[PDB]
Amino acid sequence: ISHGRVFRRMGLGPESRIHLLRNLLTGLVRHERIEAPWARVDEMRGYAEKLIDYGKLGDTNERAMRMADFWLTEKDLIPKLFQVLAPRYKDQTGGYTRMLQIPNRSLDRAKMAVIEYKGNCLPPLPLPRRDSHLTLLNQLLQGLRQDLRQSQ
Amino acid sequence: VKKGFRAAFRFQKELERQRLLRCPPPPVRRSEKPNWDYHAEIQAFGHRLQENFSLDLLKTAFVNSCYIKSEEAKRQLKSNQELSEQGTSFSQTCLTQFLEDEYPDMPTEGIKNLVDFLTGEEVVCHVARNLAVEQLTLSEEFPVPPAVLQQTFFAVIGALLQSSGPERTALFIRDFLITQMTGKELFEMWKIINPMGLLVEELKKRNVSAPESRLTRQSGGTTALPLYFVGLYCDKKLIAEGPGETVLVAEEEAARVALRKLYGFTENRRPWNYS
């Protein structure tokens, strides 16, 4: 039975789980885009979001500083968190990271995933667009837009 | 290597046998395989049927215009057209006489249909393969086309007639062609459509009103395997009775049996008298 347990089980125990997610999160803050196994990235996305939330409070706060000290291992990144990432998202109140699935890994055929922090300098991921607005179904729906707007 | 020769040769023979079941050779004229001399074969063809064919006429009854033309063209005598015509004409006349005398009531259309069936390709080819006409006949394409077998077979009958007279030829025809009517029902040789119309026509000719179709017996009216027994009547007297699954089919079969009874071609008719 596992009803209502939101935390995956990975590594050699709870502690190794936190440490694995910590290394993933450090790599993400250092490079702003990493390809990792899908389940691990899905577990780490929440932590990266809340890390940006803690980083918005700013250097002066001590709780946020302790948290970013634990969750960043090469400390050169703590400046970045408080001076490049958190400032970058002064407008967005949520959803700072985008997560996609990518071709499975060559060796062990695992389910992969690229995760990145929105707005970085890197070449943009090939996001999937929706169908062009000029397609047949969209045109008929646009006609319905007009005809319903005039009636109402 | 096991030392020996007998098992090796035995296995080679068995392999050859298997190799002559898959990929059988293209069939070829019996007049090319070994052990063949035409003269003995044609004389034996004569003596086998208990008939004194004249050797020259029988010889020219197996040669066809196709073969003459191919010999003329391949080189860089009489043909069997006339005998074939005589034989076909006599066969038609004699079969007509036979069927008319055996079955008097049958209409001329039906007699002509039976005569066309017996002298048709479907039966003549069958009677000509099982009496070694294809082996002796000369042609281009092997197997000989059924039309060429037919025309050669009637050429042979024509030779028989010109040699031993009408009566013996009539016995020959009674022996090989007429026998083919054995077992066959009437409307398996005389292929017709719309039988009820023909029944009404024939009944009118005998000045009696068209027949009333009733329902004599039935089982399983609603199911998918019904049985309807439909019985025609002619002024309160039965003249037939047919089975079927639909009432339409039962009526059609009642018409067929009534036609057979009026034409004297029932299942239990007096069997032909070969003696």
Partner: protein
């Protein structure tokens, strides 16, 4: 325990070729409508993703060559500029990572 009898080729065929063990035909493949390569719906075009990772790696090699050694995460944003592209009016005060090939058409 151990088997009591060999299992025949018939039983083994009814097990091995049962549908539950067969490989299912995938109903979710298609063609990248613009790029024109195969892809699954919920996954990135493999060829496009590879051509993106190549450029990301080249950019990162330049970044490493400029930062010198480890422990040098800058405290300002970064912008990457290809040949014949002067730093725009918005990118002053941001580190520039020069590259020596024409900007890819897909890089916006």
């Amino acid at each position: 325990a151990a088997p009591k009898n060999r299992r025949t080729i018939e039983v083994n065929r009814c097990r091995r070729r049962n549908p539950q063990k067969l490989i299912k035909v995938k109903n979710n493949i298609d063609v990248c409508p613009e790029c024109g390569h195969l892809k699954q719906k919920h996954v990135l075009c493999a060829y496009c993703y590879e051509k993106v990772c190549k450029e990301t790696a080249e950019i990162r090699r330049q970044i490493g060559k400029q930062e010198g050694g480890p422990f040098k995460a800058p405290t300002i944003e970064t912008v990457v500029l290809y040949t014949g592209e002067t730093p725009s009016e918005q990118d002053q005060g941001k580190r520039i990572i020069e590259r020596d090939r024409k900007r890819p058409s897909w890089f916006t």
